[PDB]
Every structure is written in C-alpha cells, then in structure tokens.
C-alpha cells in the first residue's frame, strides 16, 4: 500500500451512559449502575481514485485476469465470489494488480 505522513484520521464513537435510578440520599461516590443499551445505523464512504491508462505497442496479446473455474454445485459452494449455500460470502482466490507486461 501507500505510506503516508498524514493518513486518514481515526473516527471513534461511543454511546453515552444513562444511569440507573439513584438512591434517595446523597452518595458522594460515582455511579456504577447503568442501563444496558446498544446503537446501530448506517455509514457511507466515498473514495476518489486517480488511475493511469497506458498505450503499449507490443504485438502479441497480454495475459489478463479471468475466471477459469469449471463448475460449481449450488447445493454446496455456490458461485465463486458469491454467497455459498449457508449464506456466507466466500472469496475464492487472491488477486494481485500486476497482469500487464511492460519492459524494464
């Protein structure tokens, strides 16, 4: 990846405490009894990327990334890079970025 002096900042979140019913008389100690709760919601992320498109004059065709798996039974594994039988998402094989030949 990309080494950075200033990376994207780290975003922290917590859900504020709500105390349970206090005693009648004043207690100077801090309050340890809370109402159990959790939070939920949506988050979106928008990236802007900069790419280089190239022109190489080699004659013969380059190699490229293609999906060669012969067949798959939906009763078990489903489609590669797709949800299998039990509902989990499976990533078949690792994918690097260097498929284009370019001379030194």
């Amino acid at each position: 990846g990309f080494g950075l002096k200033h990376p994207p900042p780290m975003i922290l979140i917590k859900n504020t405490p709500v105390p349970a019913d206090p005693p009648t008389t004043f207690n100077p100690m801090p309050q340890t009894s809370f109402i159990t709760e959790y939070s939920t919601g949506q988050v979106t992320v928008e990236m802007l990327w900069e790419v280089q498109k190239e022109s190489s004059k080699r004659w013969n065709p380059e190699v490229q990334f293609t999906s060669n798996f012969g067949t798959s039974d939906p009763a078990v594994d489903g489609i590669p890079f797709g949800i299998n039988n039990l509902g989990t998402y499976v990533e078949s094989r690792p994918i690097g970025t260097r498929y284009i030949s370019k001379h030194l």
Binding site: S56, R58, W59, N60, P61, E62, Q64
Partner: protein, 105 residues
C-alpha cells in the same frame, strides 16, 4: 506532382482510442504484375468432365487488378483486438480514407 527526388508520402501506422470512437491506420507495400499480356480472355468450364455439371461457369478475364482490404486482421493487431473485445460490447464502421503513393515502375 513533385519531381523524382521528393517523396510523395510517409508511413503512418497507429491506433488511438479517443472516446466512444477509435481510429486505426496502417500502411503496406504491394507489387503488381502484368496480367494476361494486356488481353481480355473469355473463360469457361463445361460440366462434361472433372467436378461435374454443377461446376460450370462462364466469364471474362481482365488485365486489371484490385485491392481487397476486407478482413478484420488488416486493421487490428492481436493486442489491439484484445483491448477491444474485453472492454467494449459493440462496434460499427463509420468512415474510411485510402491513399496510394510512392509508385515506381
């Protein structure tokens, strides 16, 4: 137009992808023999012998000769073809220019 010493044109071969349209350009060298000693013959094959009656034909020959550039692999290279068919889902021709030069006899 220009005299013997100057050249009547220069080599151009490139393919540039400009957008929704692409331009291919190429240049080749040809040689034209003299056919039939400058004579028109008739030609025929009667169905009497050889292949059979279904093969009969009649026509003429001509001293003239012609360019046939119609195939795809004239205008593309195996790399540029690959670049086309993986990204793009359709193609149609738009227009063309053709030029012949540097004739010498």
């Amino acid at each position: 137009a220009e005299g013997v010493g100057n050249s009547s044109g220069d080599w151009h071969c490139d393919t540039k992808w400009m957008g929704d349209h692409v331009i291919t350009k190429s240049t080749r060298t040809w040689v034209l023999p003299t056919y039939g000693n400058h004579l028109y013959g008739p030609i025929n094959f009667d169905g009497t012998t050889g292949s059979g009656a279904n093969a009969a034909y009649a026509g003429y020959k001509t001293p003239w000769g012609y360019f046939d550039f119609n195939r795809f692999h004239c205008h593309f290279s195996p790399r540029d073809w690959q670049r086309l068919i993986n990204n793009h889902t359709g193609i149609r021709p738009k227009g063309l220019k053709i030029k012949v030069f540097n004739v010498q006899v």
